[model samples]
Target chain A: NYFSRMLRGEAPVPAVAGTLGGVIRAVDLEAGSLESDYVATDAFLNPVGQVQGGMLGAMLDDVTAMLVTATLEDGASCSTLNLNLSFLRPAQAGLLRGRARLERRGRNVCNVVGELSQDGKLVATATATCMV
Target chain B: NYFSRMLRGEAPVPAVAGTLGGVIRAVDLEAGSLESDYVATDAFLNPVGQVQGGMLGAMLDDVTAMLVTATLEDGASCSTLNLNLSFLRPAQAGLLRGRARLERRGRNVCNVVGELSQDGKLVATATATCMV
Candidate 1:
């Protein structure tokens, strides 16, 4: 419900997501997943001219958490437990395509993994836990 | 060193660190540690009005990386191999104090861990590996 409204711009997007320019593209509750397009802002770069690893971690956190978020009821909410992330390649500033899906659904928690890519090359991957 | 120059205003701070309002307070190369003050920007809040976990992850990432970075040569640099993070408590949007110290310095890599606290309470912890 909340995220549903957000998907259509009927509700305010989370400030962090907004600051980093994140947009939800699709949600499939049946699949317990989410797809998104988030811009890796130039403002979040490291000295190497690449997006900072932590910035990418934030992006992964949002996208992965949204996998569970996309399915929440209007008044329902959740929290992220943790995330294990690996950066496969350097990321540049621009549009980043991301997806998070449930690897397994627990009674009160969700195990999710996500992938982020730029220009069709894998840039990072993360596995996360979110409270249901 | 680049970090040293950045600290004294001789070099440009990384964009991500600047965007998040991160200020390096101290760096002890002999000890392989760092201290910083980074604002948890309101723009990074979640629906619960808490700072998103991933944003915290990003903050941790920078501090941890800086521990190794503070010791780098002017033209030398390092890369982050991975980060495993845990969110211990909800974080609010405001000044967050953070620190990272070297757990072990490997021949070609470094093991680091970081802590982030808000209002003097531990909020999260992370273990990271940074390539030398």
Candidate 2:
């Protein structure tokens, strides 16, 4: 699928992902997983000098959504229904990796979990439900 | 105090909020509540023409954080620990209002809920836990 090919770095990313400052670095379509990366640009900072939660949240949302898409059959699409996130540490500038795994796929909803880490340490974790 | 003053529109907003395309339309400091607004700029739209989930998430995060701060004692501050969001409907460009309410304030944590709506119709809802 185009989405999977995009996540696998075999094709150009859709405009939205590029707009959000994310790049898919790797993908395991069979395993329903992927690794993505983002840059915590100045636009995503707060007064506290830390990366804003919403930016991280967006990254997780995209990663998990891609994982879900990796498992979908052709002509199927999903939208995020709910998302829950925990910010474990303050994310700073530079490179950050987003890893996502699809945990379950029901008839109507799929569950996915993801983590954002920097330098091999956990920074944030998230669980998301997507409507298929 | 600067945060409060900014929210009240008594002072210019910090650069971060402006960069994210948000404006504080109204505030109720005494009630620990506020109404903020955002423009779903083209920069925030996803591939589907809907406002990206992350943009809405970020707006909710900021609205909740402000609500938590409004209830804080002097010199007190909070950081977002976890956030849960429900995306009820697709959000499009134009003005969106974010209404935040402080649900509970404990010694070390605060719970806040927020809604993003346009034309009195709900687009999304969120609950956030913040560490004080």
Candidate 3:
């Protein structure tokens, strides 16, 4: 019900998602997929001028988690158990897109994988296990 | 020089670190270790009332990266190539401490591991591979 309220615009978005400029733009329940967008704010930059890698990880996790959350029954939720991430390219301040797919589902856990991209280039990839 | 300046309080802290309320509290180059602190603000929470997992991952990555950075020669920096993270416990809004150590070093890469804790309880752990 909480996630439903969130998707229906009845609840406030989580504060962390706001700070990172994240928005759940689309959800395809039938396909077990979701799309979200985040802006790499200047607030997330490092000494090297690229957005911090952790921030990118947060974006990936957010969308992937949402993709899993999108399929849950009311009153049930999930938490991340582990995440395996790889950084392929450095990212900068800009609009980044996150795409997630549910790889498998079980009674109490699920596996999801996703990626983050900026300007159509892959920047990061992640595989996550979530406890439902 | 950048790390030195950051330690001496001569340079601006990176914007991303600031958002998470992270501060470099200490660094011991002789031992190849570092310590940092972060506050889990309302911004990082999920519907389950715990800090988002990715945010915790970022905190771990930041401290470990800094630990590796402390051992690097001037003018050289490292990038995270891969990160394997495990979420052992859920974290809430409060003061969290990060401790990082250099596990091994090579000509062009290094391995680091660290953990985040609140009130002396382990919340998460991470192993990172950085390209120095």
Candidate 4:
């Protein structure tokens, strides 16, 4: 009944609806998790043929934000404080998955980790600190 | 002039030819600097109204990459080792500036710092480590 729990405002996914082209296929409150996927577009590239680095961080941020919203109490939200990211591979315009969860959440602040991945290859990894 | 110096391959802006909607208005080799501008588009936004976070990193990465290539020895290139980013302010779709420079370049690696800005405020700041 996770969907039912979420419908009752007991969930913290933030109810995001934007054109990032990712779908939130499932979420597990018990496991404390969320999953999403999107496509890389040429329109997203910088000078290099590879996808832009910021885009990868942005995707990770999105997933991490969801993890925060979905896990918070009534009217409580969070903002990113800092994120350290590492890119493991180059990204081409294609299908990609972004996933996230809490590494730790404390009073007034939270720590999170997430990834931008494609076809099982890790494109980027991030550790984010957020204010609760 | 640095511009003329760069135009003659004595410089290394990467000669990018993309539609990133930015202008490389200037560079100063002696000062180890470059300046550019871009417009934030909704296509670059995530679910939230604010611009995507990764785009900030990507922009900074672009600048850092330039700092790497522009200062390298003949036929030598660089790749990102890691990046630590901090968000000072949320970016709105508008005219923005991207500025970058080489902080230090060792025998095997280089470090770069840059900012994504609007008007006069720092929207984001990034420090990147790259292999030379």
Best by DockQ: 1
User: Distance from true position, residue A106, model 1, in Å?
Assistant: 1.2
- Model 4 Cα lDDT, one tens digit per residue, A9-47: 574332222435656666776677788786767766644
The worst-scoring run of ten residues by lDDT in candidate 3 chain A lies at: A1-10
A4-95 in candidate 1: lDDT tens per residue? 77778798888888876788888788877788888987788887789998888888888888888776666667678889999999999999
Give the TM-score comparing model 3 with the true structure, all chains together.
0.95
Candidate 1: TM-score? Answer: 0.95
For all candidates, state DockQ relative to the true structure.
0.87, 0.64, 0.80, 0.37
Encode model 3's per-residue lDDT on A1-132: one tens digit a residue: 566688778987787788678888888888888889999988889977898888899888898888888888987887889998999998999899999999888899899999999999999999999998
**TM-score, candidate 1, first chain:** 0.93
Writing each residue's lDDT as its tens digit, candidate 4 over B23-122 gives 6666776788877776667655643466666666667776666666667665566778688889899887777788888787789888888888987999
Question: Native-contact fraction for each model?
Answer: 0.92, 0.65, 0.84, 0.51
Expressed as tens digits, the lDDT of each residue in B2-44 for candidate 3 is 7778778898777778877888888887777889999888778
Model 3 spans with C-alpha error above 4 angstroms: none
Cα displacement (Å) at residue B51, model 1 = 0.6
Give lDDT per model, in order.
0.86, 0.82, 0.87, 0.71
**Could you arrange the candidates by lDDT from highest to lowest?**
3, 1, 2, 4
**How many clashes does the backbone of model 1 have?**
3
**Given the true complex, what DockQ would model 3 score?**
0.80
